[PDB]
Amino acid sequence: NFMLTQPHSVSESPGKTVTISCTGSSGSIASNYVQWYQQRPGSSPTTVIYEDNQRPSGVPDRFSGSIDSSSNSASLTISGLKTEDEADYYCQSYDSSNHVVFGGGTKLTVL
Secondary structure, X not given: OOEEEOOOEEEEOOXXXXXXXXXXXXXXXXXXXXXXXXXXXXXXXXXXXXXXXXXXXXXXXXXXXXXXXXXXXEEEEEOOOOHHHOEEEEEEEEOXXXXXXXXXXXXXXXX
């Protein structure tokens, strides 16, 4: 029953850098690839990271993904924060049965 744990909320001011973490529980974060999605209200999720740290074409380079095996976590880091970045973010991976697992989500507020 691999699960992904995310904090509810983060906030930061425009131009600064914010980090959203996603910690593996009942399994290792490194066993399967982590994706990150941006999602606005009533809209489908947008991929901002796949395969732990790959950006889809078009996604600004201020979005970066990483893995910290020592904390069993993955992180989405957003630098040079913009107002348009205010949104929900979900990490996502797979359990030992290759079924999809989502983090609980984080709301980013740009102050």
